[PDB]
């Protein structure tokens, strides 16, 4: 008998509260555009304190130096999304533009665009089956069987794939997610 | 908060500490007893590390009071569970939860 999520839930509605919680936790811990002069100046101080090797770019090793991020399964995705030019590390401009997506007085649509970018690994604008499984696997780990996780991934995409190309576009993702108001959870003080 | 009630006792000495990983089987029910989730139905035990903010506060405070082999009923108030918001599509707001948890192993 195939596995169903509680209340026959789709994997987006199911994992989004954890996504919004763990991304907010990461940034709040990193901090311990839409910014004004003082808010950018505050972020420049907290950036240089985590540079460690003074290379001018936050790397994966420096991000995992904080003990609060060691067991956060969404660290690498946030680093990958911040890495706009895709060089493996995070510059200060990428740091400012990455934190700006979570500032209050930010747009709702851009906060859903970040939530979409959590699952869209290759950043082509479409969530593929392998992408959705792999990102959910980082959060689920061993707590589900791969067969169970694969089954709910299949049903979610099949029900959400409106145009029938096997992938989930941002418009299809917004049709499943829109009523969740996940943007209200993605807020960090600067 | 969380009320721990023993169903079956385990070895009294080995209690999970911060940093350890608790391997459990659980069945989650609403206060009226209606089941909403069960790791036994999945044939996959649930695992989490204590002190790393991975579970609700009722599980953090409740499972810590448990020991290896013990099976207990955990009655959790909303403030220690999902509060006045609930969990979207599963847990209603202000919902008191009852968890039948058994601590299988620590690793
Ligand atoms: C990819 C998302 C990820 C899911 C898993 C890795 C699979 C895992 C088996 C969860 C079940 O998935 C089938 C399922 O189990 C429940 O049914 C349950 O019985 C419970 O309550 N559990 C169950 C575990 C014991 C404690 C308690 C609990 O803490 O769960 C946490 C939880 C939901 C925390 C929320 C997250 C956002 C935040 O706002 C809120 O703040 C109060 C707390 C889970 C483990 C997250 O750490 C990880 C995921 O979410 C709850 C109802 C929903 C939950 O599904 C999501
Ligand atoms: Ca560096
Ligand atoms: Ca970069
Ligand atoms: Ca993609
Ligand atoms: Ca599609």
Residue numbers in the entry:
A (entry chain A): -50 to -19, 12 to 169
B (entry chain B): 1 to 107
Paper text:
Calcineurin is an essential virulence factor that is conserved across human fungal pathogens, including Cryptococcus neoformans, Aspergillus fumigatus, and Candida albicans. Calcineurin is a serine-threonine specific protein phosphatase that is a heterodimer consisting of a catalytic subunit, CnA, and a regulatory subunit, CnB, and is activated in the presence of calcium and calmodulin. FKBP12 is a member of a larger family of proteins called immunophilins that bind to immunosuppressive molecules and mediate their activity.
We now report high-resolution protein crystal structures of fungal FKBP12 and a human truncated calcineurin-FKBP12 bound to a natural FK506 analog, FK520 (ascomycin). Due to inherent challenges in forming the full-length ternary complex for crystallography, we next generated a novel “mini-calcineurin” as an alternative approach to capture FK520 bound to human FKBP12 and calcineurin. Each of these novel FK520-bound structures represents a key addition to the tools necessary for structure-guided design of both FK506/FK520 analogs that show increased fungal selectivity.
